[PDB]
Nucleic acid binder design. Structure first.
Ligand SMILES: [Zn+2]
Ligand SMILES: [Zn+2]
Ligand SMILES: [Zn+2]
Ligand SMILES: [Zn+2]
Lengths: 89, 89
DNA sequence: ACCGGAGGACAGTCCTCCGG
DNA sequence: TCCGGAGGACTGTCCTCCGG
């Protein structure tokens, strides 16, 4: 089943043979089969672990700071910004 | 297709007839077909939105509580109590 | 009666690779 | 060449209701 890295990236049929394969072989490229990427399980128990801890950190957050701040953090991607937020106390 | 509240809790086969079904007519029972109860979507995109929020709060709380059992706190249910606690900031 | 879990239709993923 | 998105095997859900 697994297509080689390059065929994946390019989205063309892979011959998939061993070691290399038609277009990496032909075209002159180093053909690889990368490991599947580890992702979190998409189960319902796990979505619920995570929604319900996020909820409880939100509940605790609100005893400490205003709701308007909740909404800012819940969007920040930068670690300086998450820290500065906290520094304006 | 939908089974009745009761056949649902008792786990027996439901006749499904409306308004009152098999048993619920028999045992002269309060027969409800309660509406289809919502869950949040199990999709990858939504698992991931929620995991990004949780990470950001998780990070914000590493700085509020650099010292431990945040989990102790996360389990409490009382608002006064939690706030009595935190005022040991 | 009661309820753990089998059974199965279905929701939605997460791959490959076709074709504009 | 290139990538949107179709195709479709599959993972895991989430019902019902069997039979112990
Ligand atoms: Zn290939
Ligand atoms: Zn290759
Ligand atoms: Zn019924
Ligand atoms: Zn009924």
């Amino acid at each position: 089943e697994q297509a080689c890295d390059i065929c994946r990236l390019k989205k063309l049929k892979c011959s998939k043979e061993k070691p290399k394969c038609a277009k990496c072989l032909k075209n002159n490229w180093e053909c690889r089969y990368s490991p599947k990427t580890k992702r979190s399980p998409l189960t319902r128990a796990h979505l619920t672990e995570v929604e319900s801890r996020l909820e409880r950190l939100e509940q605790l957050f609100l005893l400490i700071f205003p709701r308007e701040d909740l909404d800012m953090i819940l969007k920040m991607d930068s670690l300086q910004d998450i820290k500065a937020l906290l520094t304006g106390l």
